[PDB]
């Protein structure tokens, strides 16, 4: 809910600096993705509603134990709000910040073999909105510039023309680009009053709607409950 | 054996998955309401011999005053309405409109955005399969009125199976000459011109006597939930306008003669009830496109 | 054109700044905004008012 | 002595019926003491949508 | 309708409207989908923890 509230690149990068990798990994066992299922939407239809499960839903799903699974878990947290179940990663790695994983070599993770096309297909980029895609491209650029793969990122953008139009205008390692960036990346914000307490047909739309409706209540009460446990640590 | 299927029911292409939320539904409803006021204001301006009613309507729709030396394009609302129409048709469309832009355009007027307040009747006839034995030829022509022409060349009478799907509500069959039709495992009645059928009542068997060809004319009615502002006449005009403007020109898509064929074909696809909700929002957007473009041609 | 220092006048209000479209907020929405501090950091256009 | 929350628990010698009547009265009144944030949520449902 | 409106608002966090249809709201949606999850491991988990 906090990560989805950020609406600027410099807010999003600041949040990733303070957030450990533990928050991007779920301890719930979940279900296997890419499964054709029938769900109940009784507000609209008497019959069951066909849908397919995906990693970028708001619900935690089982994840693979490879490096590909950990990168997919990070991106899913940014774009959907929840991570995936990857057990026994390691105490040292889980303490590191998300930005440290993406942009630093001291972590001990190797991401040179990652294929950006495969990761996008596994995350169902075709079903992602403009804000979600821009967030995903930010994570790709950070990973590419860490590995010296700047050319591969540009070539990958040439192949996918629609992704090129919405590519973020920031160069990692340059502070000027982050300062002057004017991107809008807020999936969840203070709702327009027109929003109602109604369900949505798709799994993704309903879960995104749930985050939107609960943002006002979370905004008012998160500070005190966080402080009630943070003090005397 | 031979199998005959309707042309428009074949291979429905996947539809878009964007701009179907509550906020985006309101924007389409806002565009339809504001586009209607543009048409009415132009009529009022012509009658009153004053451009003042049109200036207010254009300013609300386009966020800028009309100018004599600037082309009247409808502003940013027109661009957003055009882009969402492209996205609804196919999943391969770019879908580049920001959420901040959509939300600000839904605040121009207050509308519920509910797409289930009413219903509309669609007339496309879905013949999923016509199964004919040997020595018989069967041809299916037309969508709004389906004409099935059958010839029996063999020695004796042949039985022909008709499948109308499980979605259409009612189907009327009319023949050039009286003919016999009955459900599976049912006795055949005396020959008569007209049959009224429920498509959910299994496949239907038609007795084809040897001799002159028998032609069956089929009409069907299906009810699909639509918003209260839905108008089939304006949706049909917008569908034809969008094709001519190139809004539907994307790779790996199917083209239809009318929005009637488009919505029914997507309904009959596997897991087709997912697509029918997106098609209704597309129809409403085309209703806004027709009124806006007729008032502001480009 | 006029040689003003830090001219507050633009020939037209820019559609895009730094490759992104400038956000437009109606005056009514901006009046009810409680997250105004986050919005002003990016910049916006106010309309629907005189 | 303090409880898990900040409330103070008094352990005293007192009669059984006076204890039952007093403590039951406390529970009935305590059911209607709610946080201000929950109160604000209740009002927002009653008032119009804007 | 006063007793029913009070209970439905508590249950569904929304006020009944004549135009819409009363199905129980988001609480009904979660309850029905969790029921399917309990019955079989093939049924998915689609209700977020929030």
Residues 6+ apart with CB under 8 A from A204: A54, A56, A57, A58, A127
Report d(CA A153, CA A166) in Å as an integer. Answer: 14
β-pair partners for A141: none
Q: List the one residue out of B112, B18, B27, B16 whose CA is nearest residue B78.
A: B27
Residues of chain B with Cβ-Cβ distance to C12 below 8 Å are none
- Between strands B192-197 and B170-183, the pairing is antiparallel
Q: DSSP secondary-structure letter at D29?
A: H
Residue E11's SS3 state is helix
What is the CB neighbour count within 10 angstroms for residue B216? 23
Report d(CA A172, CA A182) in Å as an integer. Answer: 16
Q: List the one residue out of A51, A61, A53 whose CA is nearest residue A82.
A: A61
Residues of chain A with Cβ-Cβ distance to D49 below 8 Å are 193-194
Q: DSSP secondary-structure letter at E40?
A: -
- Between strands C24-26 and B214-226, the pairing is unpaired
Report d(CA B291, CA B297) in Å as an integer. Answer: 10
B217, burial (CB in 10 Å: exposed 0-12, middle 13-18, buried 19+): middle
Provide Rg for chain D, Cα atoms. 17
Report d(CA B186, CA B68) in Å as an integer. Answer: 73
Go through chain A and list every residue after which a break occurs, taking a C to next N gap over 2.5 angstroms, comma-separated.
none
- Between strands B204-208 and B158-163, the pairing is antiparallel
**Cβ atoms of B74 and A159 closer than 8 Å:** no
Residue E47's SS3 state is coil
Q: Which other chains touch chain C, taking contact as 3+ CB pairs less than 8 Å apart? A: A, B
Element at B208 (helix H, strand E): strand B204-208
Residue A142's SS3 state is helix
**Cβ atoms of A12 and A137 closer than 8 Å:** no
Chain-centroid distance, C-alpha B200: 22
**Cβ atoms of A154 and B68 closer than 8 Å:** no
* Distance from the first to the final alpha carbon of chain C: 26
Report d(CA A59, CA A45) in Å as an integer. Answer: 23
Q: What is the resolution of this structure in A?
A: 5.7
| Residue E13 near chain D (CB below 8 Å) | yes
Angle between helices B22-48 and B99-106 (to 10 degrees): 50
β-pair partners for B158: B208
Q: Hey, which residues 6-35 in chain C have their CB within 8 Å of chain B?
A: 21, 23-26, 28-29
Residues 6+ apart with CB under 8 A from B221: B121, B122, B123, B168, B169, B170
Alpha-carbon distances of C22 from A168, A181, B27, B62, C25, rounded to whole Å: 15, 12, 19, 16, 10
Cross-chain residue pair A193–D49, CB shorter than 8 Å? yes
Q: DSSP states of A15-57 as a string? A: HHHHSBGGGGB--S--B-SS-EEEE--TTT-SSPEEEE--TTS
Q: Which of A182, A190, A192 sits opposite C42 (nearest CB)?
A: A182
Q: How far is A179 from chain E (nearest CA, A)?
A: 33
**Cβ atoms of A181 and A168 closer than 8 Å:** yes
Alpha-carbon distances of A129 from A56, A155, B96, B248, D14, rounded to whole Å: 11, 22, 8, 20, 67
**Cβ atoms of A208 and B21 closer than 8 Å:** yes
Report d(CA A114, CA A93) in Å as an integer. Answer: 19
Q: List the one residue out of B43, B37, B69, B71 whose CA is nearest residue B56.
A: B37
Q: What is the dihedral of CA B104, B105, B111, B113, to 10 degrees?
A: -100
Provide Rg for chain A, Cα atoms. 18
Supply A14's token pair: 């600041």
Residue C16's SS3 state is strand
Alpha-carbon distances of A205 from A86, B18, B99, rounded to whole Å: 25, 10, 14
Q: Which other chains touch chain B, taking contact as 3+ CB pairs less than 8 Å apart? A: A, C, E
Report d(CA A111, CA A68) in Å as an integer. Answer: 8
Report d(CA A63, CA A29) in Å as an integer. Answer: 9
Q: List the one residue out of E46, B14, B281 whose CA is nearest residue A41.
A: E46
Residue B229's SS3 state is coil
Supply B291's token pair: 């009124």
């Amino acid at each position: 809910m906090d990560v989805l509230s950020k609406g600027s690149l410099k807010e999003l990068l600041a949040h990733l600096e303070k957030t450990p990798l533990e928050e991007a990994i779920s301890y719930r066992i979940g279900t296997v993705p890419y499964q054709n299922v029938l769900i109940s939407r009784n507000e609209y239809y008497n019959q069951l509603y066909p849908d397919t499960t995906s990693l970028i839903d708001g619900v935690s799903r089982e994840g693979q134990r490879n490096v590909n699974g950990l990168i997919m878990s990070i991106i899913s947290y940014v774009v959907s709000g929840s991570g995936h179940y990857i057990p026994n990663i390691g105490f040292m790695l889980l303490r590191r910040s998300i930005l440290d994983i993406l942009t630093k070599h001291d972590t001990g993770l190797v991401t040179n073999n990652l294929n950006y096309g495969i990761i996008a297909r596994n995350l169902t980029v075709s079903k992602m909105n403009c804000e979600q895609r821009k967030r995903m491209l930010i994570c790709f650029k950070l990973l590419a510039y860490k590995d010296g793969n700047q050319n591969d990122y540009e070539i990958y953008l040439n192949q996918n023309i629609p992704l090129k139009q919405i590519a973020p205008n920031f160069i990692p390692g340059d502070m000027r680009t982050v300062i002057h960036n004017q991107d809008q990346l807020a999936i969840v914000g203070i709702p327009a009053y027109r929003l109602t307490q109604s369900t949505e047909l798709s799994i993704r739309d309903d879960n995104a709607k749930s985050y939107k409706l609960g943002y006002v209540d979370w905004y008012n009460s998160n500070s005190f409950l966080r402080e009630r446990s943070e003090f005397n640590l | 054996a031979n199998r005959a299927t309707s042309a428009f029911l074949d291979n429905p292409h996947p539809v878009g998955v964007n701009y179907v939320d509550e906020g985006s539904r309101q924007f389409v409803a806002v565009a339809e309401l504001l586009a209607s006021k543009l048409i009415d204001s132009s009529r009022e301006s012509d009658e009153s011999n004053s451009d003042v009613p049109f200036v207010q309507a254009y300013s609300k729709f386009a966020d800028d005053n009309p100018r004599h030396l600037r082309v009247k394009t409808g502003g940013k609302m027109a661009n957003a309405l055009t882009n969402v129409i492209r996205s609804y048709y196919s999943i391969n469309a770019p879908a580049i409109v920001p959420q901040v832009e959509i939300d600000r355009l839904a605040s121009k007027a207050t509308v519920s955005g509910d797409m289930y307040n009413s219903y509309a009747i669609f007339n496309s006839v879905p013949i999923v399969e016509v199964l004919s034995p040997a020595r018989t030829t069967v041809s299916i022509v037309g969508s709004d009125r389906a004409d099935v022409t059958m010839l029996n060349t063999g020695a004796g009478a042949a039985n022909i199976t008709f499948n109308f799907g499980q979605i259409a509500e009612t189907v009327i069959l009319k023949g050039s000459v009286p003919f016999q039709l009955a459900r599976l495992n049912q006795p055949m009645p005396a020959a008569r011109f007209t049959y009224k059928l429920r498509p959910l009542d299994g496949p239907f068997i038609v007795v084809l006597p040897v001799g002159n060809p028998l032609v069956i004319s089929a009409t069907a009615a299906t009810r699909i939930q639509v918003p209260l502002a839905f108008n089939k006449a304006l949706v049909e005009s917008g569908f034809q306008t969008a094709m001519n403007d190139g809004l539907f020109d994307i790779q790996n898509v199917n083209y239809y003669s009318s929005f009637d064929e488009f919505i029914i074909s997507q309904y009959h696809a596997q897991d087709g009830i997912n697509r029918v909700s997106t098609c209704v929002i597309l129809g409403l957007a085309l209703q806004a496109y027709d009124q806006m473009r007729r008032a502001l041609p480009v | 054109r006029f040689g003003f220092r830090d001219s507050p006048f633009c020939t037209s209000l820019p559609r895009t700044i730094m490759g992104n479209d400038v956000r437009r907020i109606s005056y009514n929405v901006f009046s009810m905004m409680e997250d105004i501090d986050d919005v002003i950091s990016e910049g916006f256009i106010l309309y629907d008012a005189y | 002595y303090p409880d898990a929350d900040g409330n103070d628990v008094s352990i005293i010698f007192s009669g059984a019926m006076s204890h039952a009547i007093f403590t039951y009265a406390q529970s009935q009144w305590n059911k209607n003491i709610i946080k201000l944030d929950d109160y604000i949520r209740e009002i927002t449902l009653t008032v119009p949508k804007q």
